[PDB]
Write a protein that binds this ligand. Structure first.
Ligand SMILES: *[C@@H]1O[C@H](CO[C@@H]2O[C@@H](C)[C@@H](O)[C@@H](O)[C@@H]2O)[C@@H](O[C@@H]2O[C@H](CO)[C@@H](O)[C@H](O)[C@H]2NC(C)=O)[C@H](O)[C@H]1NC(C)=O
Ligand SMILES: [Ca+2]
Ligand SMILES: [Ca+2]
Lengths: 4, 301, 299, 65, 4
């Protein structure tokens, strides 16, 4: 889960 | 003159009916003996969250009512208990529960000292036991829990019509075995009437006084610590009213009495004429056996 | 109609004969009723039972004889009280102390700080229930004097495949430091090193922002991640969030395995993922996190 | 109070006692059997009829008069 | 119940  | 005939009839008619009734009973009892060649079983996986008691557990996140493992003190080994996490903010450790007459409560001193019955059963399908059973936590444990710090008591009941009432107690303690599990309660309130402190509501003076539980020692049918000074061994309260309780002379409340199906019952049914049966005189009188009766505790704030 | 008086003599006796007979049958029935009683004193037998062998951890217990997996009470050195745990004991004297298990999505992993601190879910002797042992306990087990631990992660897809990932010197800090995760190094494993981060090909710093070594535990009600937003809240879990993750073993349990963006409430991947082994949109079917003394993992 | 009348005076007393004695054993057995439900594999499903007993107890009195 |  790479958040912006 | 012609009375002897109609008399020998009604006598012959009944003695042959009773003969049948006996036949039915030996049938039923013989069938039950067979079913008892194997036990009932449960499978209660243990919740991770644990604590000294239910109040700590709810504060630790366990927000559902089910069987939990608690450890009041490092000395004692962890033991199972049913936690009511829904009634009045939860955190209530169940020490006594009645609801279906599935468990026998007329036991000796030792079973009452160690505890007995079923703490919890499976929630139809689930792997945990979210339903409580009928049980008595055990005097040694109850005494240790109450002596940990101020403890309040919550007694609950329900008639066979569905009506509910409760007797609260802001202070509750039970001394250890060496002190015959002496009981002390105070700071009452509720809709069922203070039967443990005041005694039988519908009684006067001496009569109402001899039914006060507060301050009484615990008695079982094989251990008389009642407030009844008798000479006849059959006149002990526990032997008469059923199970183990803080019997005085004898009671205004009998939470651990025999479970009468239907509620209504009368002296002609009672094994000793006495008023055994899950009684709480101050609410429904002496001849009504509740359908639900439970006792729970929690640290007092 | 009306028996003769001579009949009276006989009738009187008949009644007495059965009356007394009825009486005897009763004296006998009550006897049987008393024998029935001794048969109804015991409670239902509980299938789930806890073994008597206790020790500082599951490995310690196994070194003490314990041979089969199930529930045991352990009590690490610095622990106030003992606590129940599940021990996986193989045929080589290895005692693993499992602390996280997923396998059916029966347990809701969207818990708060305290819940993740004290633990939740259920322990089963057969090792078939989901749970989170609890951060404090995990901290106590992995930080005992001189005993260096190792973490083994086990995944299993819905096709039947399984993979693992090992980490040397596994360790979880105290609550004062938000139960920080730290490990000396990836010990190898077909599941792939996900704690090292993953290159989701979206940034120049590739790996970095989704690495876990050194991250503090985070929950929706207690944010300690490296993101202005709230990883724990958006992904609905309790985990060592970064910005946000490459491994998400406490994520939402997606039935089937293949979930999509549309499945997520917010929009980001919140399933039980582990990028070095499956796409971020593939939620594992089973998952297990267990620890054991490092000297035990084949030296 | 004749020879036969005495024999029947007692027979009424005895049956009035057995009636009570049974009416109770009937209840005792119902509670006992039920109290095995939490211990044994199962508890014999049953229902107690007191009416039959009560109907007879009022019946006995009708002839004791 | 009492035992007066
Ligand atoms: C105390 O109780 C005794 C026992 O009688 C029972 O309790 C009563 C309150 C009442 O409910 C009765 O129906 C119960 O059977 C009472 O006994 C009295 O005994 C004397 C003979 O010694 C008799 O003449 C009285 O009629 C009995 N009481 C009455 C008026 O019924 C006693 O009176 C009760 N006293 C108190 C403190 O109320
Ligand atoms: Ca006495
Ligand atoms: Ca943040």
């Amino acid at each position: 889960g790479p958040r912006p | 003159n012609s009375n002897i005939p109609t008399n020998l009839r009604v006598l012959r008619s009944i003695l042959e009916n009773l003969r049948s009734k006996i036949q039915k009973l030996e049938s039923d009892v013989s069938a039950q003996m067979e079913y008892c060649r194997t036990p009932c079983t449960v499978s209660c996986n243990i919740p991770v969250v644990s604590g000294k008691e239910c109040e700590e557990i709810i504060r630790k996140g366990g927000e559902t009512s089910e069987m939990y493992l608690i450890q009041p003190d490092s000395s004692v080994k962890p033991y199972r208990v049913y936690c009511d996490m829904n009634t009045e903010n939860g955190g209530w450790t169940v020490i006594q529960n009645r609801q279906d007459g599935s468990v026998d409560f007329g036991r000796k001193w030792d079973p009452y000292k160690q505890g007995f019955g079923n703490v919890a059963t499976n929630t139809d399908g689930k792997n945990y036991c979210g339903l409580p059973g009928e049980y008595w936590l055990g005097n040694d444990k109850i005494s240790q829990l109450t002596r940990m710090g101020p403890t309040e008591l919550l007694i609950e009941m329900e008639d066979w019509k569905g009506d509910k009432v409760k007797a609260h107690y802001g202070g509750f303690t039970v001394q250890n075995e060496a002190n015959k599990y002496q009981i002390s309660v105070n700071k009452y309130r509720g809709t069922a009437g203070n039967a443990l402190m005041d005694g039988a509501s519908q009684l006067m003076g001496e009569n109402r006084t001899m039914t006060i539980h507060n301050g009484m020692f615990f008695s079982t049918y094989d251990r008389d610590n009642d407030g009844w000074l008798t000479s006849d061994p059959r006149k002990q309260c526990s032997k008469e009213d059923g199970g183990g309780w803080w019997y005085n002379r004898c009671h205004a409340a009998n939470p651990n009495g025999r479970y009468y199906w239907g509620g209504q019952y009368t002296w002609d049914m009672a094994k000793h004429g006495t008023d055994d049966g899950v009684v709480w005189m101050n609410w429904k009188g002496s001849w009504y056996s509740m359908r639900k009766m439970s006792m729970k505790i929690r640290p007092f704030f | 109609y009306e028996a003769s008086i001579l009949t009276h003599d006989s009738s009187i006796r008949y009644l007495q004969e059965i009356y007394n007979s009825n009486n005897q049958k009763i004296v006998n029935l009550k006897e049987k009723v008393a024998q029935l009683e001794a048969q109804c004193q015991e409670p239902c037998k509980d299938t789930v039972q806890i073994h008597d062998i206790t020790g500082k951890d599951c490995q310690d217990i196994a070194n003490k004889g314990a041979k089969q997996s199930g529930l045991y009470f352990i009590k690490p050195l610095k622990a106030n009280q003992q606590f129940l745990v599940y021990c996986e004991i193989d045929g080589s004297g290895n005692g693993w102390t499992v602390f996280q298990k997923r396998l059916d999505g029966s347990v809701d992993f969207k818990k708060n700080w305290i819940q993740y601190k004290e633990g939740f879910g259920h322990l089963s002797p057969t090792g078939t229930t989901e749970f989170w042992l609890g951060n404090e306990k995990i901290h106590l087990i992995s930080t005992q004097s001189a005993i260096p631990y190792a973490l083994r992660v086990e995944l299993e897809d819905w096709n039947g495949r399984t993979s693992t990932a090992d980490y040397a010197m596994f360790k979880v800090g105290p609550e004062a430091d938000k139960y920080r995760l730290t490990y000396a190094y990836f010990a190898g494993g077909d599941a792939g090193d996900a704690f090292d981060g993953f290159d989701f090909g979206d940034a120049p710093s590739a790996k970095f922002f989704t690495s876990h070594n050194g991250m503090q535990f985070s929950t929706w009600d207690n944010d300690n991640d490296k993101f202005e937003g709230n990883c724990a809240e958006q992904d609905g879990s309790g985990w060592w969030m970064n910005k946000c993750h490459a491994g998400h073993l406490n994520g939402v349990y997606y039935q089937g395995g293949t979930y999509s963006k549309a499945s997520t409430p917010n929009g980001y991947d919140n399933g039980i993922i582990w990028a070095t082994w499956k796409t971020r949109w593939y939620s594992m079917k089973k998952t297990t996190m267990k620890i054991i003394p490092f000297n035990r993992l084949t030296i | 109070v004749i020879e036969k009348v005495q024999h029947i005076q007692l027979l009424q007393k005895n049956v009035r006692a057995q009636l009570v004695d049974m009416k109770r054993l009937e209840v005792d057995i119902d509670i006992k059997i039920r109290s095995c439900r939490g211990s044994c594999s199962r508890a014999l499903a049953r229902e107690v009829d007191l009416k039959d007993y009560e109907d007879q107890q009022k019946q006995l009195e009708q002839v004791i008069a």
